[model samples]
Target chain A: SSYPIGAPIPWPSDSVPAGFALMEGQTFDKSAYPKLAVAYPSGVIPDMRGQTIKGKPSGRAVLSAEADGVKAHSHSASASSTDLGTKTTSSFDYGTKGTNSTGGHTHSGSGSTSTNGEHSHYIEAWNGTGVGGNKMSSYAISYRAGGSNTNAAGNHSHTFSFGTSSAGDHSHSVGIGAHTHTVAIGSHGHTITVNSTGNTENTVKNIAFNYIVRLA
Target chain B: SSYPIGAPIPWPSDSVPAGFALMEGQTFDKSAYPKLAVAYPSGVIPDMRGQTIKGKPSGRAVLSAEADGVKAHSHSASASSTDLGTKTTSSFDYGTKGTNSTGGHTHSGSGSTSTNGEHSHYIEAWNGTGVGGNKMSSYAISYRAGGSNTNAAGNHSHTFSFGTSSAGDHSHSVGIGAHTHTVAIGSHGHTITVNSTGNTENTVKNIAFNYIVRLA
Candidate 1:
């Protein structure tokens, strides 16, 4: 028999980007309900000459099942950034599940810019999981000032899945996650990074993020 | 001479329909820095008749000003589903020498189900001081609905205004005026009405409106 599948919980304040909300519920049909995500205000860094800022990314997850109860899961990860205007990278992983599901995820953010006539780069990554459910993942990267005022940028990516054995279980989940990081390069550059991971089931997840930088 | 102004104050809560913030040591040309205004989410109503829901009504505003050592102002607005499908009407008046600015906006949304025969509407108005920089005013209204049967019907109206005056020396004064009325003509009928009037520089005024049932 087909049961009603309701909406997933929203992301927590500390885990979401300003002016945006996390995707909730599960239909296994991305086209049916394309999720919407946004970078929080103050989360974007102003172009700086020789400074880097980063953080642990935050976000929420909501799951639902027909004839099955809905559940929510939360996850977090550490990420870093640098002002090399060339390349910077970050990565994280989730490897646990609670009483409801099992799954894992990863995300990244990157950029490139020019500092003192030199090339600088920035990159970031995040990973998370639900103990019993399948795995879902995401990532983002960007570049700026690649060649004489050439700046490239990109955003975060996310994916969700039902774990191996629990693929079509009677449980559902929603969650939120977030963090901060610093990056330092050369004799005058700076770096920032943050990482976190946890397990949750059948609850709403809310996450928010913010970042800032100062030239020295 | 004038300088660039920075960001406005952060919104109090994500749920708030409109937000504004002004910084110190900034000057506003008053004419250049238009006042910001938007319809509250509470103004939008949802499904009276179902019809595969589509676009929805929304409103927003923003402001920025700076001049060496003077004044600044900024505002923003967002709407939710609950705020999208409702009917509302509102109005305002500004006294002499008063100046006001309102944001440009758009409204759109569709009924949830085609067979249910649902509909929506919106209205907005403003009154500014003809000369000088002493008075300003703004207001907006929105309505919507959906239902299981084609017989369901609803309507609404709202009026609001912000007024500023500069009659006594360089002193400034502000005021808010509003009026609203609503009625459900039948188990399937919804109606909204609003009337408003205000005087600036020692003047009196009145406004009226009405709506009737139609077989369409």
Candidate 2:
């Protein structure tokens, strides 16, 4: 294959071909391979393992094949807290109850005493015995006969009624007490800010290859 | 100046050199530029505008300057919602109150009748003048007291006391009513799934350059 001495080719297998060397950082004698030595003025090969290649910046060139390297560099990114604006919900409903107060009131009642059957009692009167027919008309006295003296009367009953006095009706005043209610809150969220953790480097999916240069 | 016909170099200025041509797509005369015709058997130059360069796969060759390009290829990435497991809260507190019931009761009172001073009554008595004063002892009769006969009594008052009946004391029962409380919920969130919206292509900061090649 005809190629420039400093050009790199990708080699597939582990066994290197004739006239080529692995791009490992190894020192070489200047006189051993004169054309390859021109590519590495320092006499040290480049280490290509676990490394990426980049073209030089514009307006620059490889005046000689001496290589240069840079320390690992990366791009950084972060995100500040996103402001989700505030949201307010409408008011909820609560039930009601009757107020505590004195209710205006009045009381009334009626009843009768138990009954006893109708009946009467017997009576007798007694006085001294000296009274002529004329004295009987002139004087008021109680006289009892010697043998049997009795008086009789007809049956009767006594009746009565009673009631309680009135003091007029009045109502009590009322005022409701102060109170508070508990409300269940709905499901919701807040503003959040996050940064990607760990390595901040940009990356790509790539297959590794060994870059072999023309050295014979 | 002399160069192998198909070699490419990054040129700084807009004007191309006499022995070189911009890598724009154009047909050339093979007989006029014999060395470049060897590089391009088809006599067509490569078009390098708005494109990146890549080496061939391993064991491949650059047989001619016939150009080939790829449709843009990109990487894809997506993220799924993270699982934030469930959380429970402790119970809260509510207030207490008294209940409604009938209250047992009783009533009592007392008062008196009005008063007046000492007083007397007067009357006259007349009977047929028969026998002597002994007849007066013999007969009990209503009489009219003549001229100035009077009887009187001293000051007095009738007094009394009274009371009410009883029904024994008792207590009322109590139980709480069914009720629910409102609770304010703290802020929370859920799992989210998202894809980068606009572009999936990888990019870098780069400046443009003219890639010139030898043609004369």
Please, what are the lDDT tens digits per residue for candidate 1 over residues B1-216? Answer: 021122121111122122222222223343333331121122221111111111233442222221111112112222221211233323222222323322222222222111221222221222323432211112111111111111222222222222222111122222322322333322111122222221111111101101010101
Instruction: Report, to 2 decimal places, the DockQ of model 2.
Output: 0.07
lDDT of each: 0.22, 0.44
DockQ, 0 to 1 scale, candidate 1: 0.00
The DockQ leader among the candidates is 2
DockQ of each: 0.00, 0.07
Candidate 2, residues B1-216, lDDT tens digits: the string is 122455556678998889788978788889998867765666877676654443333353432121222223233333333333433334333334434434334333323232222222221222342322211122343653332212222223332323223232323333324544444333544343333332344334455789777776
TM-score of each: 0.09, 0.38
Candidate 1 interface RMSD value: 66.3
For candidate 1, write residues A29-147 as lDDT tens digits: 23332321111122221221111111111131111111211222222322233222332232233333233112222222222212111123321212232221111111111432221
- Fnat, model 1, is 0.00
Writing each residue's lDDT as its tens digit, candidate 2 over A1-216 gives 345675655443344456776677778777977877887888877765534456666667643232322223333332333333333334443334444344343343323334323322221222344643322121221232122112222233333333333332322223323444444333334343333422223333233345555565
